Design a binder for this molecule. Structure first.
Ligand SMILES: Cc1cc2nc3c(=O)[nH]c(=O)nc-3n(C[C@H](O)[C@H](O)[C@H](O)COP(=O)(O)O)c2cc1C
Ligand code: NA
Length: 362
């Protein structure tokens, strides 16, 4: 029953702890990377969630690495998001925008001027991203070799997160979630496998965490620390980005730095979903010891797991991913122990209403 009780999340009080994890769906309008009324209906259908966390959204045009992913850096984008947030709030829902810079998980055809994408170091991501073929359908393509950011360019990255959070506030969102996970730009700097820099942003864990903490500080001053959430994936390997040979201690360092800044929540994307070893309770307790604020757990969660960890005080809420794709009233289904619709993975990425707004309620 506690999974269905209210929770204060920074400045915002949500009615339950069944959260919608951020899910890239690649249905935005190109050119311009504009959210659509169809996306608004998708999110409106899921506003019984205690907190919707949007698909990852570009902080700038440079941030783009997927065709079809939305932006929050242009007046067109802001206007369209404003209708989405209004739609969710008119269902008495709550909504946070996940903000990313994709870094080296990108393609030069998606970048301003067709230039190479940026990263902490000029090292191939060794993975693929999603473009659109001439008929508008998602296709997987090798990422482009990135250019290493100059030291003097790091403030511009911070400044672009800062402005994007300003726009998130103007656009009506309740919170923002910094995307510091899954091998995108912030995680690239955190990871010794993607970051081989020789300036103050590479090497030691203090140098590697510096950018993400500069971002947290800037966006907290732009809006408020109690409006800032962050998603991390600091244990295991994700999209070919690992967390180095001291991953547990390094993770606990970052978590303690985040706690010092009073942020609204810590959202941990666990490896049990991808194919790694799941968090031990001893690790979870070390996290909790360092982070007394809201912790969101994610990745292959049962209701059993959710109750267990919530009743134990180790997490405060759970973000459901694929089950939210297929079940707009997931909250009701979980309370009533009803069954779930089956997922149609062939329509997760790209397309239109089918596999998106056409999953039914009880
Ligand atoms: C289609 C799809 C899109 C996703 N998009 C994002 C994203 O934009 N940002 C992010 O942080 N995680 C993203 N994820 C990871 C999920 O948010 C989630 O954490 C993961 O799938 C495991 O949780 P689950 O077992 O409930 O699906 C995505 C996953 C899927 C399947
Ligand atoms: Na040089």
């Amino acid at each position: 029953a506690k999974l269905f009780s209210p929770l204060k999340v920074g400045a915002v009080t949500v009615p339950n702890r069944v959260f919608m994890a951020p899910l890239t769906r690649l249905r935005s309008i190109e050119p311009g990377d504009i959210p659509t009324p169809l996306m608004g209906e998708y999110y409106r259908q899921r506003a019984s969630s205690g907190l919707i966390i949007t698909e990852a959204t570009q902080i700038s045009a440079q941030a783009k690495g997927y065709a079809g992913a939305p932006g929050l850096h242009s007046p067109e984008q802001i206007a369209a998001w404003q209708k989405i947030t209004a739609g969710v709030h008119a269902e008495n829902g709550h909504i946070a925008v996940q903000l990313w810079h994709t870094g080296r998980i990108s393609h030069s055809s998606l970048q301003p001027g067709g230039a190479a994408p940026v990263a902490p170091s000029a090292l191939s991501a060794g993975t693929r991203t999603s473009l659109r073929d001439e008929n508008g359908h998602a296709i997987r393509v090798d990422t482009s070799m990135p250019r290493a950011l100059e030291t003097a360019e790091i403030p511009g990255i911070v400044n672009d997160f800062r402005q994007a959070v300003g726009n998130a506030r103007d656009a009506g969102f309740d919170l923002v979630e910094l995307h510091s996970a899954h091998g995108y730009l912030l995680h690239q700097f955190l990871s010794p496998s993607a970051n081989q820099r020789t300036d103050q942003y590479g090497g030691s864990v203090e140098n590697r965490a510096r950018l993400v903490l500069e971002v947290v500080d800037a966006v907290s001053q732009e809006w408020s620390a109690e409006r800032i959430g962050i998603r991390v994936s600091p244990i295991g390997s994700f999209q070919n980005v690992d967390n180095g040979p001291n991953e547990e201690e390094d993770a606990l360092y970052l978590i303690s730095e985040l706690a010092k800044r009073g942020i609204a929540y810590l959202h941990m994307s666990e490896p049990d979903w991808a194919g790694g070893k799941p968090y031990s309770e001893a690790f979870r307790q070390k996290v909790r010891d360092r982070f007394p604020g809201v912790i969101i757990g994610a990745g292959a969660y049962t209701v059993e797991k959710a109750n267990d960890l919530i009743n134990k005080g180790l997490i405060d809420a759970v973000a459901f991913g694929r089950d939210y794709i297929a079940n707009p009233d997931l909250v009701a289904r979980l309370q009533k122990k009803a069954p779930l619709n089956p997922q149609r993975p062939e329509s997760f990425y790209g397309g239109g209403a089918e596999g998106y707004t056409d999953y039914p309620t009880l």
